Write a protein that holds these residues in place. Structure first.
Motif, mmCIF file in Angstrom:
data_model
loop_
_atom_site.group_PDB
_atom_site.id
_atom_site.type_symbol
_atom_site.label_atom_id
_atom_site.label_comp_id
_atom_site.label_asym_id
_atom_site.label_seq_id
_atom_site.Cartn_x
_atom_site.Cartn_y
_atom_site.Cartn_z
ATOM 1 N N UNK A 140 23.626 37.417 -39.495
ATOM 2 C CA UNK A 140 23.303 38.045 -38.217
ATOM 3 C C UNK A 140 24.276 39.179 -37.896
ATOM 4 N N UNK A 141 25.561 38.978 -38.192
ATOM 5 C CA UNK A 141 26.545 40.033 -37.996
ATOM 6 C C UNK A 141 26.261 41.239 -38.880
ATOM 7 N N UNK A 142 26.014 41.002 -40.172
ATOM 8 C CA UNK A 142 25.642 42.093 -41.069
ATOM 9 C C UNK A 142 24.462 42.876 -40.522
ATOM 10 N N UNK A 143 23.419 42.171 -40.090
ATOM 11 C CA UNK A 143 22.251 42.853 -39.525
ATOM 12 C C UNK A 143 22.635 43.757 -38.363
ATOM 13 N N UNK A 144 23.498 43.261 -37.463
ATOM 14 C CA UNK A 144 23.949 44.073 -36.339
ATOM 15 C C UNK A 144 24.692 45.307 -36.813
ATOM 16 N N UNK A 160 32.809 47.187 -36.003
ATOM 17 C CA UNK A 160 33.282 45.804 -36.147
ATOM 18 C C UNK A 160 32.826 44.881 -35.019
ATOM 19 N N UNK A 161 32.931 43.586 -35.312
ATOM 20 C CA UNK A 161 32.798 42.528 -34.329
ATOM 21 C C UNK A 161 33.624 41.349 -34.832
ATOM 22 N N UNK A 162 33.828 40.367 -33.965
ATOM 23 C CA UNK A 162 34.476 39.116 -34.338
ATOM 24 C C UNK A 162 33.533 37.989 -33.982
ATOM 25 N N UNK A 163 33.481 36.976 -34.843
ATOM 26 C CA UNK A 163 32.571 35.859 -34.639
ATOM 27 C C UNK A 163 33.286 34.567 -34.966
ATOM 28 N N UNK A 164 32.860 33.495 -34.308
ATOM 29 C CA UNK A 164 33.360 32.173 -34.641
ATOM 30 C C UNK A 164 32.734 31.710 -35.950
ATOM 31 N N UNK A 165 33.552 31.169 -36.844
ATOM 32 C CA UNK A 165 33.031 30.619 -38.089
ATOM 33 C C UNK A 165 32.653 29.158 -37.875
ATOM 34 N N UNK A 166 32.039 28.561 -38.895
ATOM 35 C CA UNK A 166 31.586 27.178 -38.756
ATOM 36 C C UNK A 166 32.726 26.160 -38.661
ATOM 37 N N UNK A 167 33.913 26.453 -39.183
ATOM 38 C CA UNK A 167 35.040 25.534 -39.027
ATOM 39 C C UNK A 167 35.656 25.629 -37.632
ATOM 40 N N UNK A 222 38.483 25.962 -36.287
ATOM 41 C CA UNK A 222 39.672 26.765 -36.005
ATOM 42 C C UNK A 222 39.571 28.114 -36.689
ATOM 43 N N UNK A 223 38.361 28.580 -36.977
ATOM 44 C CA UNK A 223 38.197 29.739 -37.842
ATOM 45 C C UNK A 223 37.343 30.811 -37.178
ATOM 46 N N UNK A 224 37.716 32.067 -37.416
ATOM 47 C CA UNK A 224 36.968 33.230 -36.976
ATOM 48 C C UNK A 224 36.794 34.186 -38.142
ATOM 49 N N UNK A 225 35.864 35.127 -37.984
ATOM 50 C CA UNK A 225 35.717 36.191 -38.950
ATOM 51 C C UNK A 225 35.636 37.523 -38.240
ATOM 52 N N UNK A 226 36.328 38.509 -38.797
ATOM 53 C CA UNK A 226 36.130 39.899 -38.421
ATOM 54 C C UNK A 226 35.101 40.455 -39.397
ATOM 55 N N UNK A 227 33.973 40.937 -38.883
ATOM 56 C CA UNK A 227 32.959 41.586 -39.712
ATOM 57 C C UNK A 227 32.985 43.065 -39.385
#
Length: 99
Positions: A18-22, A32-39, A41-46
């Motif tokens: 979904x981030x890639x699509x955006x 860029x954006x930042x999103x919560x990952x499935x773990x 305590x984890x995030x991703x910068x896309x």
């Protein structure tokens, strides 16, 4: 710290794809954006760099966050830093993706 949750670049419920699509709509290096990952305590910068979409993991541990070997007091501090300093080669985080 939860200050990131109200920031325009932060997305609580956004998958990798979904981030890639955006990031496809206005293809510009520096988006860029930042999103919560499935773990818990984890995030991703896309972000877009060198014509490609890249994902960078950020780990929350206790009262700090970590990107590679670089520790910051909070996710907002981390992003603020990389809006002014290169994150990936020469590219800074420049163009936040919101809605």
């Amino acid at each position: 710290s939860h200050m990131h949750e109200s920031k325009e670049w932060y997305h609580a419920s956004l998958t990798r794809a979904q981030a890639e699509h955006m990031l496809m709509r206005v293809p510009r290096d520096g988006a860029f954006l930042v999103r919560k990952r499935n773990e818990p305590n984890s995030y991703a910068i896309s972000f877009r760099a060198e014509g490609k979409i890249k994902h960078c993991r950020v780990q929350q541990e206790g009262q700090t966050v970590m990107l590679g070997n670089s520790e910051f007091d909070s996710l907002v501090d981390l992003i603020s830093y990389y809006e002014k300093h290169p994150l990936y080669r020469k590219m800074k985080l420049r163009y936040p993706i919101n809605e």
